[PDB]
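Quick one: co-fold with chloride ion.
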Amino acid sequence: AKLVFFAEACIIGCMV
Amino acid sequence: AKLVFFAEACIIGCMV
Amino acid sequence: AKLVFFAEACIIGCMV
Amino acid sequence: AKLVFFAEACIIGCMV
Amino acid sequence: AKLVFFAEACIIGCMV
Amino acid sequence: AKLVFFAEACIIGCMV
Amino acid sequence: AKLVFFAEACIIGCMV
Amino acid sequence: AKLVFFAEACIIGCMV
Amino acid sequence: AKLVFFAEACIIGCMV
Amino acid sequence: AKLVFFAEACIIGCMV
Amino acid sequence: AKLVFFAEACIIGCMV
Amino acid sequence: AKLVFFAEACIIGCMV
Ligand SMILES: [Cl-]
Ligand SMILES: [Cl-]
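Sure, here it is.
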């Protein structure tokens, strides 16, 4: 998997 | 803009 | 207190 | 969106 | 001074 | 409050 | 190329 | 769980 | 040992 | 090679 | 000692 | 210059 930082703004690190 | 680090505790990166 | 990076997955750090 | 980390070496955070 | 991350996009850390 | 990266040199993420 | 944070668990910023 | 930075000495973030 | 991010508030990593 | 964070001030890391 | 970010490529911190 | 992470043991980024 990969650690991806979703910038929804705000930036969260979720693993995929 | 600049990436502000808010914390309400949990810290989250966010923009302005 | 410490800064723990919690894994509810998204990683959020919070001050416990 | 997600914060991509480009590197052309120097690494820079950027969005998509 | 302060370390501020200017999101110009792309995010750079410059001290002010 | 926010996470401020002071730079008084060295850098510390003090909280304010 | 980009800086990819693999998660195969532990996380490593390998480059690709 | 929570991210843990093991001091193998190198440092690796692992999810425990 | 592990790298743990204590809080004093200012957040500093230390090897325990 | 190492990842040095250069100080041309803005902090950029690059792989020298 | 100092925390130096070596490159193997994968970037890992180690205490030298 | 370049950011250096001194291992005081705690770790502090200082500009040398
Ligand atoms: Cl994948
Ligand atoms: Cl100021």
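If it helps, The first strand of chain B starts at residue 3 and ends at 7.
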